Design an enzyme around this catalytic site. Sequence first.
Site, PDB file in Angstrom:
ATOM      1  N   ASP A 113      -1.665   5.417  -5.244  1.00  0.00           N
ATOM      2  CA  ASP A 113      -1.890   4.689  -4.594  1.00  0.00           C
ATOM      3  C   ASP A 113      -2.295   3.068  -4.930  1.00  0.00           C
ATOM      4  OD1 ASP A 113      -2.886   3.310  -2.106  1.00  0.00           O
ATOM      5  OD2 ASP A 113      -4.496   4.803  -1.670  1.00  0.00           O
TER       6      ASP A 113
ATOM      7  N   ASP B 181       0.754  -1.246  -0.031  1.00  0.00           N
ATOM      8  CA  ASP B 181      -0.046  -0.214   0.094  1.00  0.00           C
ATOM      9  C   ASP B 181       0.709   1.312  -0.103  1.00  0.00           C
ATOM     10  OD1 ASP B 181      -2.116   1.694   0.238  1.00  0.00           O
ATOM     11  OD2 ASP B 181      -2.477   1.646   2.428  1.00  0.00           O
TER      12      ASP B 181
HETATM   13  C1  LIG Z   1      -6.928   7.350   3.694  1.00  0.00           C
HETATM   14  C2  LIG Z   1      -6.699   6.834   2.415  1.00  0.00           C
HETATM   15  C3  LIG Z   1      -6.317   5.254   2.836  1.00  0.00           C
HETATM   16  C4  LIG Z   1      -5.815   4.467   1.384  1.00  0.00           C
HETATM   17  C5  LIG Z   1      -5.190   3.108   1.564  1.00  0.00           C
HETATM   18  N1  LIG Z   1      -4.579   2.876   0.355  1.00  0.00           N
HETATM   19  C6  LIG Z   1      -6.215   2.245   2.014  1.00  0.00           C
HETATM   20  C7  LIG Z   1      -5.668   0.873   2.325  1.00  0.00           C
HETATM   21  C8  LIG Z   1      -6.705  -0.335   2.350  1.00  0.00           C
HETATM   22  C9  LIG Z   1      -7.736  -0.317   3.505  1.00  0.00           C
HETATM   23  C10 LIG Z   1      -8.553  -1.569   3.472  1.00  0.00           C
HETATM   24  S1  LIG Z   1      -8.024  -2.442   2.130  1.00  0.00           S
HETATM   25  C11 LIG Z   1      -6.741  -1.546   1.654  1.00  0.00           C
HETATM   26  N2  LIG Z   1      -7.178   2.136   0.895  1.00  0.00           N
HETATM   27  C12 LIG Z   1      -8.510   2.245   0.927  1.00  0.00           C
HETATM   28  O1  LIG Z   1      -9.023   2.976   1.711  1.00  0.00           O
HETATM   29  C13 LIG Z   1      -9.293   1.851  -0.207  1.00  0.00           C
HETATM   30  C14 LIG Z   1      -9.224   0.268  -0.391  1.00  0.00           C
HETATM   31  C15 LIG Z   1     -10.007   0.003  -1.450  1.00  0.00           C
HETATM   32  N3  LIG Z   1      -9.998  -1.409  -2.157  1.00  0.00           N
HETATM   33  C16 LIG Z   1      -9.120  -2.494  -1.642  1.00  0.00           C
HETATM   34  C17 LIG Z   1      -7.724  -2.272  -1.983  1.00  0.00           C
HETATM   35  C18 LIG Z   1      -6.860  -3.487  -1.617  1.00  0.00           C
HETATM   36  C19 LIG Z   1      -7.267  -2.989  -3.063  1.00  0.00           C
HETATM   37  C20 LIG Z   1      -6.145  -2.317  -4.155  1.00  0.00           C
HETATM   38  N4  LIG Z   1     -10.782   0.859  -2.324  1.00  0.00           N
HETATM   39  C21 LIG Z   1     -11.003   2.182  -1.873  1.00  0.00           C
HETATM   40  N5  LIG Z   1     -11.862   3.202  -2.616  1.00  0.00           N
HETATM   41  C22 LIG Z   1     -12.443   4.370  -2.049  1.00  0.00           C
HETATM   42  S2  LIG Z   1     -12.310   2.584  -4.175  1.00  0.00           S
HETATM   43  C23 LIG Z   1     -13.511   1.231  -4.241  1.00  0.00           C
HETATM   44  O2  LIG Z   1     -11.129   2.255  -5.087  1.00  0.00           O
HETATM   45  O3  LIG Z   1     -12.987   3.918  -4.654  1.00  0.00           O
HETATM   46  C24 LIG Z   1     -10.187   2.692  -0.953  1.00  0.00           C
END
Ligand SMILES: CCCC[C@H](N)[C@H](Cc1ccsc1)NC(=O)c1cc(NC[C@H]2C[C@@H]2C)nc(N(C)S(C)(=O)=O)c1
Lengths: 378, 378
Positions: free
Chosen positions: B221, B38
């Site tokens: 990201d 990430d």
């Molecule tokens: C404050 C910002 C935080 C950003 C970090 N990158 C964080 C890491 C994370 C948390 C839970 S799973 C992964 N990512 C997310 O919040 C995050 C994960 C995923 N989808 C899952 C992701 C694994 C796939 C790449 N989708 C979103 N969207 C809003 S979307 C559907 O693409 O519009 C946001």
Amino acid sequence: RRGSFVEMVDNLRGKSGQGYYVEMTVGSPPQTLNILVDTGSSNFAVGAAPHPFLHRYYQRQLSSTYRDLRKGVYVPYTQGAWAGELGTDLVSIPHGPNVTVRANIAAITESDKFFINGSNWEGILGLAYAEIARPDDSLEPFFDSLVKQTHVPNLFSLQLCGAGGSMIIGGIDHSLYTGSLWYTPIRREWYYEVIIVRVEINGQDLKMDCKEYNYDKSIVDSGTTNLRLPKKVFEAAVKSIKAASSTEKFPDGFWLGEQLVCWQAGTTPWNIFPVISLYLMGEVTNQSFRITILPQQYLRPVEDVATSQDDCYKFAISQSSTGTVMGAVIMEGFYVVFDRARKRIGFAVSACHVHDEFRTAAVEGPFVTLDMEDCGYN
Amino acid sequence: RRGSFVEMVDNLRGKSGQGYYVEMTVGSPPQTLNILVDTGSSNFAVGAAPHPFLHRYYQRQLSSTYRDLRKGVYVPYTQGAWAGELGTDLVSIPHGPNVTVRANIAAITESDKFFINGSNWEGILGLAYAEIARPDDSLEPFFDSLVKQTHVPNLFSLQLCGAGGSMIIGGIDHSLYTGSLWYTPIRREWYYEVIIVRVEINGQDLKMDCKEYNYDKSIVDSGTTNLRLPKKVFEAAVKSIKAASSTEKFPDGFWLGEQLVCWQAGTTPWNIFPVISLYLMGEVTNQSFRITILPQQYLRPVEDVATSQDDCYKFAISQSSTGTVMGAVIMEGFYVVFDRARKRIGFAVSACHVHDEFRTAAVEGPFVTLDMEDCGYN
Ligand SMILES: CCCC[C@H](N)[C@H](Cc1ccsc1)NC(=O)c1cc(NC[C@H]2C[C@@H]2C)nc(N(C)S(C)(=O)=O)c1
Ligand SMILES: CCCC[C@H](N)[C@H](Cc1ccsc1)NC(=O)c1cc(NC[C@H]2C[C@@H]2C)nc(N(C)S(C)(=O)=O)c1
């Protein structure tokens, strides 16, 4: 289901005839090679140039962390020898401890009868002590570097599974053995030297002065195939073994390792061969214990003559003029703990040793044996 | 056939919808876990207690090298959040650099909508900078620890292969891309912030003030699925995309990501959808370059309805109130170099991006774009 050292279980591949090996990653970027586990030497060395028997080799110019020591090194073994160049580099064991150290490494540039065709290993990990390292004892062996540079406990254990195995580094895994672990003292820290105090064939004492058993020395060597015995001991052992297996006769060359004897697939009459027991000095005065091996250990398989139904075997007990060598065929029946911290070697029945429904390898004790100190050669 | 970083190639698994992950070994003895890559966060954290969606987790009592920092930590994301406990332990990446470091590690004890069922990962590797780490910037992120404790160059690159991939640490592997690498400046070191200066749909300029494109910020990201755009930009983009794909009509919910549209196995009319180009600020005054993605990137596959012949897709461009997020679907068309040492991010056509016989993702330049500095939000 868990086991703290679980990730190190099954990290070995190979056989007694060609050697057991573990993966080791050297340099930066990563260069992973298959390395022979050898408790009978003390140099860490890897093929560093193309060779007919090598699938891959160490390429120093590609490692940014390699440091040249500007010193040549030559290492002769009982079987083969190699010449190379010394240096240091980062070394990790993917399926070993979770650490990385800077260790001495010999880049093998030329060799004679060292690498084995089809063995699948390209280097050797000498696990013994500094006293027998080349050029001299100032070249710190790999394990010493590991213990000094990291928190890894000064101990490793081996479970060699005959026809891979496990090398637990920094501890012991209880799933690799059954029964109790019995320890024998490491007499001196050079080779992993031990003291054999009695030898029996099918419960019958060979009746030789124990000094003969360790004449010169007796060592535990994962990097030697056979159970090697001093001349006089070999002769007596063979005579007793022949007498105990008189139900069937074999040519003299068989006992000398010059001739192979084969049986139809899955018909070897293990029952006609005797078990061999080696008594080792214990940790308490006048106390010993014994390890017993089966013919499945001292009669090792050799690639089928024509990929058919023929199990060919070579007698894996041979002569030596440099002392007793408890090689891979002996170790294959047990889980062997190299407890360097407490200067002792433990033995326990292996959870993977080859046996049948009538007999099993064993480690039993204690027994009473007097004057064991006199067994050692001075 | 060789490649210096060859051992790191193909060290990633996963998808854009559930995440790409790499194996990381923590503690002693070794505890290997699958960790989400990430670049949108800065905390290294691993599940440390049983959870319905976890096949395994970090067991601190089994690690002799674990050191408790006696401090709680809470991290909220756009999607989900978790609470845990801070500490440090040894960490290695089996298929990454040949080093081992002591890094900060958050043991996840409770979570809400964080772990994803079937994703196969149990932790997260925040690759961004200290400024956005929790509890604060004093908690050194993993990569910073790696660079400070070892000789590994301050750079990593990602090749995400859509329907695994590679994370080259300490360098770049030329087999992962074709053509030239074009670099855009990392505007500020917190998120991997960049500046988008122009947007085109099928060569047609969206004609929005560039300030709108980076309103608040624009980041790269790998841990976010979609290409997220500020409200006003999203609306304009969707209107232009609809106009360019008028050959067939889709419900409004599709463009909003609320509805899926499916085609018979292997019949998706990629040709009816337009390509999207994002122009990024270059390394020379008034010079920019552009990356162009195909519908194969912004229309992502979703598990077959009933394991039959139906390719279901979700529109992977969505709205955001926190700036532009160039997520996994955007990265899947390119080899992305996170050159922290030179404060820049490079883009090159990926050797694995999904395309067809008519169109391919592209990275082209240079172009002339004036007043790019004004595009950034202050
Ligand atoms: C404050 C910002 C935080 C950003 C970090 N990158 C964080 C890491 C994370 C948390 C839970 S799973 C992964 N990512 C997310 O919040 C995050 C994960 C995923 N989808 C899952 C992701 C694994 C796939 C790449 N989708 C979103 N969207 C809003 S979307 C559907 O693409 O519009 C946001
Ligand atoms: C000065 C003593 C050096 C002892 C080191 N252990 C060294 C390491 C090495 C060298 C070449 S391959 C492995 N081993 C040997 O010299 C050595 C290797 C092997 N057989 C090949 C061994 C890999 C399999 C276990 N066999 C022997 N015998 C004499 S035997 C047929 O068992 O009677 C000796």
